[PDB]
Structure 1
Amino acid sequence: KNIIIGAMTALITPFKNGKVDEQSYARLIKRQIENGIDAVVPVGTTGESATLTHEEHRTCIEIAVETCKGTKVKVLAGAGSNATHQAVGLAKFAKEHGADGILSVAPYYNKPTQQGLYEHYKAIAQSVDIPVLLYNVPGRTGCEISTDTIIKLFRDCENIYGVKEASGNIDKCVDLLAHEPRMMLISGEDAINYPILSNGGKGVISVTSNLLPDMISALTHFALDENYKEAKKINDELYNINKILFCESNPIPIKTAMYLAGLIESLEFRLPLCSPSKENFAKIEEVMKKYKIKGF
């Protein structure tokens, strides 16, 4: 199977006067590339996919593809939906614009059954010839892709090569790799990057790497090199920032941190996302003090 693994960043989408700051977006991606990141994820959850237009999805994906040209960094495009017809179109769309693979979130809100999830992802995988990474995040979607369903999709569909897990369930991560060790388990929860990697996970799709790409990259590469002692020490050091970045719903804290670090111009979201409370703003600033934040 063709795979996209390693240290990956769920890119924030900066806004300036209510529009995509395209120059900021490119600068942020180059900052990721220059700090050891192996792939970038445009217009995922951290990138506020929900509130971007289709045109803007296209724009952010094209900017990611363009900025990654001439480097080894791949573009794993966010392209998923709770409507299978739309998911299929978004996958073809992402491939069409130069993405190396797609990250496809489990249908949110309409709670499909396991059978429906299987047919959903089979249609997506059959629509393109590039790698497809499942994304399970039940706290957001209201549904869970079961281990059996993930393993069936991995075995039955050639493009599906693994899953990004954001489920706080290391038991399931054991379940997945004990029964299907060939799949690529990808950490979608920064605080437990190391436990997932030390169990045979092969990458992270990170929120924290927006702010601290060098640290997340080093952690992932240490672990992939089976230097678990060094990977754990970064994971432990990152715990405080990893947790405070979810004091409010992601990406509210990470954008707050990027703004506080001077990495993005304005602390702008699209409704229904908004600035944090005064209190959480201060907590984020407080936690950041112990970390060294690379500039441009």
Structure 2
Amino acid sequence: NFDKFKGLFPAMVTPFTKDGKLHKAGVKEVVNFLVEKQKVDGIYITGSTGEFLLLSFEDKKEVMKLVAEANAGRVTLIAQIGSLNIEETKELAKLAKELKYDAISAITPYYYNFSFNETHHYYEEISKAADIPMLIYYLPQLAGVSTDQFGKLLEIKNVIGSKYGATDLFAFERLMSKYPDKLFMFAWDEALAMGLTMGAKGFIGSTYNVNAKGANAIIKAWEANDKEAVMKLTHTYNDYVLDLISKGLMQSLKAIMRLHGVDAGYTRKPFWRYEDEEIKKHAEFITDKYLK
């Protein structure tokens, strides 16, 4: 079953010290905050929100092991392990398998307009590296890609589905219609209820790091058929999303966590470093408005 892939999966921040060192103690404290205080169903690690492009190859493995250790099998684990370095991505798949990750994902080849063919080969080679379920990222165009064409990706060995993060809910509806056998994790935080309505059961998002409660409220209202409440709670949540990102996203999440006694550290360069007081007031503003 995909039962373990139901519910909320924050895209986990990766804690760094002020000087840009991987803050190992922080990683564990974050995982504990998510499992125990946020009460998440799973954790999605080393994605965009985890600052993965700013992590060294060894930083990556360290975080994967540290997370595995802190979780202690309590919640579902997914590691985002894709990069342009195919050999590193292969070892990472093995390491995910070894550490008992529930699934992996790999972001679409970026920067260059890599072709459908190149993308297919990218994902094909990675599937032979280990037997661990794979989620691909949704990709509208590569050099110029039909919902039929994306099906070819979906059928590669070990691929169970797709992380769907595009703002295009018609494509999402078309995929849910064509591939009812595949798992689609919905990655568009401000359209959670929309997601639910076309059959999404699992959600990966940055914003669930510190407001799983507000997101679960929408899901619980939806299952209980309180349609008015689905609307009001969504308006509130999307208020929260927009207030949140009036300062840098990862700086805000890390500050909110620090305000809650979690050692979540700081972003790396080149992300902007705010004055401690400025980001503290922002953390308080979000916390007081939304997270009581």
TM-score range, shorter chain: 0.7 to 0.9
Query: Residue 47 of structure 1: CA displacement?
Result: 1.0
The answer for the alignment partner of 1:21 in structure 2 is 23
Query: Residue 290 of structure 1: CA displacement?
Result: 1.8
Alignment of 1:192-231 (within 5 A): 192-220=191-219, 225=223, 227=225, 229=227
Cα pair distance change 1:31/1:234, threshold 3 Å: farther
The answer for the alignment partner of 2:7 in structure 1 is 6
Deviation per CA, 1:103-144, whole angstroms, max 9, x where unpaired?
211111122112221221122223221111112377xx9879
Higher relative contact order (CA 8 A, sep 6+): 2
CA distance in 1, matches of 2:76, 2:221: 20
Q: Is the CA contact 1:4–1:131 (under 8 Å) kept in the aligned structure 2?
A: no
Q: Is the CA contact 1:137–1:166 (under 8 Å) kept in the aligned structure 2?
A: no
Cα pair distance change 1:54/1:97, threshold 3 Å: farther
Query: Residue 235 of structure 1: CA displacement?
Result: 2.9
Question: What amino acid sits opposite 2:244 in the alignment?
Answer: L
Query: Residue 43 of structure 1: CA displacement?
Result: 1.4
Q: What TM-score, normalized to structure 2?
A: 0.84
Partner of 1:205, secondary structure, is strand
CA distance in 2, matches of 1:228, 1:51: 43
The answer for the alignment partner of 1:122 in structure 2 is 124
Question: What amino acid sits opposite 2:128 in the alignment?
Answer: Q
Query: Residue 268 of structure 1: CA displacement?
Result: 2.2
Q: What TM-score, normalized to structure 1?
A: 0.83
Cα pair distance change 1:11/1:93, threshold 3 Å: same
Query: Residue 288 of structure 1: CA displacement?
Result: 4.0
- Rg (Cα) greater in structure: 2
Query: Residue 276 of structure 1: CA displacement?
Result: 5.1
CA distance in 1, matches of 2:139, 2:50: 15
The answer for the alignment partner of 1:96 in structure 2 is 98
Deviation per CA, 1:47-99, whole angstroms, max 9, x where unpaired?
1111112222112111211122242x121011011344443333223223332
Query: Residue 210 of structure 1: CA displacement?
Result: 1.0
User: Which deviates more from structure 2 when the two are superposed, residues 181-190 or residues 44-53?
Assistant: 181-190
Q: Is the CA contact 2:29–2:262 (under 8 Å) kept in the aligned structure 1?
A: no
CA distance in 1, matches of 2:144, 2:30: 32
Cα pair distance change 1:142/1:119, threshold 3 Å: closer
CA distance in 2, matches of 1:227, 1:88: 44
CA distance in 2, matches of 1:93, 1:106: 20
Q: Is the CA contact 2:34–2:40 (under 8 Å) kept in the aligned structure 1?
A: yes
Q: Is the CA contact 2:5–2:42 (under 8 Å) kept in the aligned structure 1?
A: yes
Query: Residue 238 of structure 1: CA displacement?
Result: 0.8
Q: Do structure 1's residue 181 and structure 2's residue 183 form an aligned pair?
A: no
Deviation per CA, 1:24-66, whole angstroms, max 9, x where unpaired?
2212212211233111122111111111122221121112111
Q: Is the CA contact 1:109–1:142 (under 8 Å) kept in the aligned structure 2?
A: no
The answer for the alignment partner of 1:258 in structure 2 is 257
Question: What amino acid sits opposite 1:275 in the alignment?
Answer: R
Instruction: Report how many aligned residue pairs link the two structures.
Output: 287
Q: Is the CA contact 1:12–1:46 (under 8 Å) kept in the aligned structure 2?
A: yes
Where does structure 2 lack aligned partners over 5 or more consecutive residues?
Answer: none
Question: What amino acid sits opposite 1:194 in the alignment?
Answer: A
The answer for the alignment partner of 1:269 in structure 2 is 267
Alignment of 1:276-287 (within 5 A): 281=279, 285-287=284-286
The answer for the alignment partner of 2:58 in structure 1 is 55
Q: Is the CA contact 1:77–1:99 (under 8 Å) kept in the aligned structure 2?
A: yes
Cα pair distance change 1:42/1:81, threshold 3 Å: same
CA distance in 2, matches of 1:85, 1:70: 27
Question: What amino acid sits opposite 1:211 in the alignment?
Answer: V
